[PDB]
Symmetry: C3
């Protein structure tokens, strides 16, 4: 019939005991009923915004999947304004889940975001749209820059790992969820024209905590284990950080963070919603091109005396030292000539030494002059502009270290600069592309626990977690979560093996390049093992 | 201390079986709805799962614009029924099968998602090939696939009949007026083939199982209520809206083809409007209705349509010709002195260059505020009775390029289902409120828990693992009248002078009822009560 | 707060605890990421040997091969193939003192990782590596040095610690055989490949997750070992002998470019979509297709038929009409179309495969500043096959015409592509050239299909967009169960799998007809892992 005769004869024609692979006994589970519960908080104000949510109900036996709502207000007025990508996560400074017995679980804003970086849905929900993240311009004092919106922040906790099995049980105890918010300055990208002073005064965080509550008939509570993260931020430009009292750790993550305290946090360009490396680069090239190639009737005006604008010769090639720039613009009027800004942005430590000129990073600029709009429409640009260039704060171009003026752009271009205060920036560039760690050494006391010359620990992290944006992580727990006691790195207090000392070898950069002056901070995250006890309320105990 | 072996495991000998991919040709039957019946009866086919329906799409020859809807294979399905001699074992509505597969990129690609199928192709001669023949594969996801061999549909020497009801070819096709649909609808025939993974099991040990059967109730047009009766044991409840285009001719100004992003829909619309929006002509433009207000662009480039300023600057315009802006391309107004929804006002800057060689304007950059809703407005609503103005002030050429879209699985009020029109949801078990929300938090949980970007407002009752456990259901009380689920929605208030306000809405409520699979004297299902 | 309707609904039968679980103490162990430098050995194939023997290392899994790609300096066009790290691999073999435990062919390891986006990205998929870079001076940097990571997916990773390869105080040798650097590199004639091939050396490093296990309790396990059979060139048959217990059988086709110089007109670089391949081809052809010149164009062969575009704009190449209209053309110059850019035919007065006929409309604007044509919109019928035709076939002895009527400038821009993992007859493996598939277990027919339904099931069951015609026999969960296999009957002759395909035939006047095909049949055989006196495998028969 339908089955092939070769198969029928292979089977039809018994002694050995076999496991039933075609049927299973449908086990009756614990009688329960779930419900999505949303709660309004209590706002408190260094005058940091803190939201407190109290969960106390006889029928809320267990809970998991915490989602924080945030009502973003209508933004009216003049100037350029936009929210940072995944705005909802960037709002969060700290989250604490505590009971009468103390803190059960807590996370720093950046660590919660890092744990959700692989979750596209959670990231989209937190605020990733052209409506929120593109930089909008307000023309009149009553013009709407941003329409009001609601964002949803998934607060991933260890209670979600195995759904109902991992859920936080409530032993007739009061659970308080505390959310500490970062200043609105962090989540906003704006220009000088925008009235931030008024905005910061008028802005208020409007949060609402949602969770999946479970009403369990005759609950049989058993003790569980929980991994609690603990971060350590090293001193400015120090290649070392130490995590004290490490007794039972499931993982250790190492990454870098830039420090922009020495700057005004202003940047030349921002790509808006489009977040690819190419998008960041293109946004920068587009901003520079306005001043880089000028079609004018006589030498261009409105630029500093320090600026050296050169007329493009008949051959099209302009020679800036060793660098040759080919500039050819079509439909240029007979009364006008093509000009090139040979030193748009320049840096140097000594008056007659090596110079880093952004105009030298261009090799070919082709376009057509529009008689109707009286502007140059660029066709193709050949350049060597990188993600680092786009990530250089404006302050460093005009820094005291620089012997030259630095910023030779027009006043128009300078006015379009945007303040970026994103709290979750990693590495030294906006895309965290440049790996500035040449070598990583992890020491458990005096002994060397781990060492690497390549980011193989990041490769394993990215592979094992199926993430495209991982960190140099040392996982100690390869045992299945919830159903087993996690495997940890056991300490030896007597031998001085109760600390994790991380040492890195930062890459050596050129002093005549502005990124050299971007202050660095080594972030070391340690996940400590704790035991959840439900005897006379919920409580946690550090495994030692 | 006693420790569990985490580095080694005893390799259990499984049930002796042999799988085989079996493909069957059906029996076609013809309201003259196309129905395909597939009979599965073999002593050696002990169990089956992973149903895949193949469809041989024919060569499309002739004149006019033609293209298939994205995921054409899923859109073909109106209903699927898996039945035995004891009756229906499992059944699903076309849209619900598609909804269950929306997160499966592979299944969606297989069903027909290509530039070859979905881009709108134009036929120039009556014998010109518009679309080349193709075969699409529709994965009919069933609860028998959840845990592979463990969840498989067992055949107790019983006849299993797979019945596939097909939607009319009108639903899966996007065409213009020039296309001879009358002939196509007559000539078109569904050519199906059902494939499945069959298992020959030596000494099968069948045990009873549980199955979730989806039930849907579609509310009346513009009625914000729907009720699912005889709810005794439900595992979930999904709530969504569907647009109803009966009050229209199902014609739309633009369609982006294969490129399905929100931006792609918007760009396709802007491109279609631009042909009539900015005109380079020798004297005032002709071929437009008297109702049209085409204004010559002044020297400064700014044309003022009320409070809205439109900057229009076209290069290489001949000395004998002038640049013109259509100030009321598409307009809507309920009353003569009320708010006006003007599509030309949705543009702020239009720059381009006139080509002397092709005698046409090549647009460079467009600054506009056009949205996904604009692209989703049926042409009929612009020329609606409620509109005191003419409405459609486009050229006869532009109007002839309009496409009929009859996609049966459209949700919300826009083509991308972006706009959430439910302001408040209220679910009642019997008479008592089971759940209520002011925000789409149930949709957020659905999208998060299922790792889907296109979820619905879903109330999940079962958070217990499937197949290995009896699903956690909402327990009913007949005596208290708690034997039904009533859904009441409050729609988001829109301004009356916007054309989309007149899109008829339909509330869809899906209930997953729990059934017990019994294998005593053939396969049979029993509703848990 | 909980709703009153829920509280009233809840407030004898045995129930499984779904809200709590006993946290079982696992086997005491400690993991460590261990990286090892190899031993390089050298038609004169590069082989890297990695020896794993340590008292602490009890078990291992997740093999990752690191490769140090050197700085590429000099003149000419150069770029690496996408997923360069996987393409480097010819063979991988994990062996003990008792012999080979597990081994895979380079292409099969890549096929097993094609659904893993992360593993593919790590192996080298960037604009920095895969876009074709041009070197202007002999000391100009074409490619900056980079490190690529190749995830060698093994059956020991399936269930993490449970599936891990245990080392019974035995020496485990990981042997990696490398394909020639010619395979992983896309370059032009201007590039000094001769020097590069001499100077290039594979710099590998094997990383793995080692486990130090206190009081390990080793139990025997099962392993699926792949076997590949490549049929004779263009032959629609291949047989895999000694098939006693197989879990699956995959069937696919590969092109053979031995009859060519492996040179191709265009390559899209990093952008790998079908449209990207097509656009890169159109862009390369357009330079010679539409010429703006002062009088008839020069620098083309005598065989070229360059026609001046009439006032009408339409140029008629036989039945095919090409509309060409270029703006801002100088008064002294005219618009010209190359009516036979690439042509193929087997007879002097028969059907022609002309590439110029594959164009219907070409619009653009002439730039006075750069003295070149800037194309705006192109209407064409160019396909993935056209882009996949090797240059040799256009100039082949089968062709009555000259074939390649492009300029010397265009011909110099041709790139050598030697990617070892190309499937089908096109670069995107779009064209399905198998009309029918027949699989025989011994002399009896096991499976037959007229459509690629086995490929559809493979793509669906593995959640992959790039699958093959696969016959899976094991639908039982891995590691926790003995896999389900086709059972042989040596006495009845049923101890081999014979695959017979029916290839759809191409048009003899179309250059792709002369692209050689190869049938590839992959069989996964079941083996038992024994740990008694070292690690050893035994074929299930
Ligand atoms: C993290 O989850 C684990 C929980 C551990 O803790 C502990 C104590 O809690 C558990 C649950 C809460 C379970 O619900 C559970 C199962 O439902 C289950 C098995 C199955 N395991 N074995 C056990 C021995 N038997 C038998 C013994 C003698 C002859 C054969 C065979 C099956 C199991 O052990 C379970 C289990 C535990 O062991 N499924 C079956 O019974 C079955 C009908 C088929 C199984 C098919 C696959 C093989 C299996 O799905 C595989 C893909 C894995 O995914 C799981 C094993 C999973 O492990 C990992 C790792 O993934 C565990 C559920």
């Amino acid at each position: 019939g339908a089955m092939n005769n070769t198969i029928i004869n292979s089977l039809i024609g018994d002694s050995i005991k076999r496991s039933n692979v075609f049927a299973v006994d449908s086990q009756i589970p614990t009688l329960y009923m779930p419900q999505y519960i949303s709660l309004s908080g209590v706002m408190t104000n260094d005058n940091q915004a803190i939201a407190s949510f109290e969960i106390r109900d006889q029928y809320i036996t267990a809970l998991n999947h915490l989602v924080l709502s945030l009502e973003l207000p209508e933004v009216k007025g003049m100037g350029r304004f936009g929210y940072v990508p995944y705005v909802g996560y960037k709002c969060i400074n700290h989250v604490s889940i505590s009971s009468c017995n103390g803190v059960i679980w807590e996370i720093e804003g950046e660590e919660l975001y890092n744990n959700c970086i692989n979750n596209t849905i959670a990231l989209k929900h937190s605020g990733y749209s052209s409506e929120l993240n593109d930089i909008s311009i307000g023309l009149t004092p009553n013009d709407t820059i941003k329409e009001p919106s609601t964002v949803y922040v998934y607060i991933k906790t260890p209670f979600d790992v195995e759904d109902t099995f991992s859920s936080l049980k409530l032993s007739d105890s009061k659970i308080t969820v505390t959310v500490t918010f970062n200043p609105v300055s962090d989540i906003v990208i704006r220009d000088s024209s925008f009235d931030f002073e008024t905005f910061n005064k008028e802005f208020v965080y409007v949060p609402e905590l949602s969770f999946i509550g479970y009403m369990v008939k005759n609950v049989q509570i058993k003790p569980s284990f929980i991994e609690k993260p603990r971060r350590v931020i090293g001193q400015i430009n120090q290649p070392t950080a130490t995590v004290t009292e490490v007794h039972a750790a499931t993982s250790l993550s190492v990454y870098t963070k830039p420090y922009y305290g020495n700057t005004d946090n202003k940047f030349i360009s921002y790509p808006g919603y489009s977040q690819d490396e190419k998008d960041y680069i293109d946004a920068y090239v587009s901003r520079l091109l306005d001043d880089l190639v000028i079609v004018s009737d006589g030498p261009p005006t409105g630029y500093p005396e320090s600026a050296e604008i050169v007329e493009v010769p008949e051959d099209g090639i302009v020679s800036i030292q060793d660098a040759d720039v080919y500039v050819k613009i079509d439909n240029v009027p007979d009364n006008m000539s093509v000009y090139l800004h040979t030193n748009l942005l320049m840096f140097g430590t000594r008056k007659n030494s090596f110079i880093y000129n952004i105009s030298k990073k261009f090799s070919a600029i082709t376009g057509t002059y529009s008689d109707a709009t009286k502007r140059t429409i660029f066709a193709h640009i050949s350049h060597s502009i990188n993600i680092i260039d786009t990530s250089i704060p404006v302050s460093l171009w005009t820094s005291q270290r620089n012997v030259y003026n630095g910023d030779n752009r027009s006043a128009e271009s300078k006015a379009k600069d945007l303040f970026i205060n994103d709290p979750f920036i990693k590495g030294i560039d906006f895309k965290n592309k440049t790996d500035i760690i040449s070598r990583l050494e992890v020491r458990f006391g005096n002994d060397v626990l781990y060492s690497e010359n390549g980011p193989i620990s990041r490769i394993y992290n990215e592979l094992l977690t199926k993430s495209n944006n991982g960190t140099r992580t040392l996982t100690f727990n390869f045992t299945p979560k919830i159903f087993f006691r996690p495997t940890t790195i056991t300490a030896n207090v007597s031998r001085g093996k109760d600390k994790l000392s991380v040492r890195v070898v930062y890459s050596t950069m050129d002093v005549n390049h502005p990124i050299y002056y971007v202050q660095k901070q080594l972030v070391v995250v340690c996940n400590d093992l704790y035991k959840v006890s439900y005897d006379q309320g919920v409580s946690i105990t550090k495994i030692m």
